[PDB]
Amino acid sequence: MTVAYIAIGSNLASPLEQVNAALKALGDIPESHILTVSSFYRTPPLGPQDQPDYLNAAVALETSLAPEELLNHTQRIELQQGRVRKAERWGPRTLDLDIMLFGNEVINTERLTVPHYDMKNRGFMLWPLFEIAPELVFPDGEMLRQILHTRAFDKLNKW
């Protein structure tokens, strides 16, 4: 069994409802169990800013699925909650499920890059992760606590 960490974001169609629904759906993924859920945070948008604030959270999920099988299931949940690909890059969405980490595995396949390529630069990922896994060490040996102690990130406000 491997512990995966998933980032959850939503800024459309009642984010609290979307995130609660996503948590129920995550609990229904085969060969998997939710270990921990962070608080929910109301975060200003990074990238394009002409969109609503996000609800961001993190979840720890224990699984015996292959990493790409986990991805299959997270994509299914996004699609079933009305996620649609649009023209604009990094636009608003009903639900975004990013696989941040899959144990200490390092993956670059066509569908899947883990660790998430930009998570070490995103407070809305790192703070909820720290809440649920304060002792976390990345596959490259970097400590989550050290990143947050060293780098400027705004603290998050609760949803």
Ligand X SMILES: Nc1nc2[nH]c(SCC(=O)c3ccccc3)nc2c(=O)[nH]1
Clarify whether 76 is annotated catalytic: no
Q: How far is the CB of 97 from Ca ion (least distance, A)?
A: 7
Query: Which one of 42, 85, 93, 118 is the catalytic residue?
Result: 93
Give me the sign of the Cα torsion angle 91, 6, 28, 1: positive
List of residues 6+ apart from 134 with CB closer than 8 A:
144, 145
Cβ count within 10 A of residue 74: 22
Is 112 among the residues that bind ligand APC (CB under 6 A)? yes
Contact 65, 73 (CB under 8 A): yes
State the binding partner of 138 from Ca ion, ligand X, Cl ion, none, CB within 5 to 8 A by kind: Cl ion
Between CA 30 and CA 63 the distance in angstroms is 8
Cα dihedral 68, 56, 36, 81, rounded to 10, equals -50
State yes or no: residue 9 binds Cl ion (CB under 5 A).
Answer: no
For the CB of residue 79, give the shortest distance to Ca ion in the complex, in Å: 12
Q: How far apart are the first and last CA of the chain?
A: 32
Q: Site for ligand APC (CB under 6 A): which residue of 16, 66, 88, 90?
A: 90
- Name which of 109 and 146 has its Cβ closer to Ca ion: 109
56: contact with ligand X by CB under 6 A: yes
Q: How many CA atoms are closer than 13 Å to the CA of 7, on its beta-carbon side?
A: 25
By CB under 6 A, residue 113 contacts ligand APC: yes
Interface with Ca ion, residue 78, by CB under 5 A:
no
CB of 48 to Ca ion, least distance (A): 13
Q: Cite the active site residues.
A: 83, 93, 96, 98
Query: Where along the sequence are the contacts to ligand X (CB under 6 A)?
Result: 9, 43-47, 54, 56, 90, 96, 122, 124
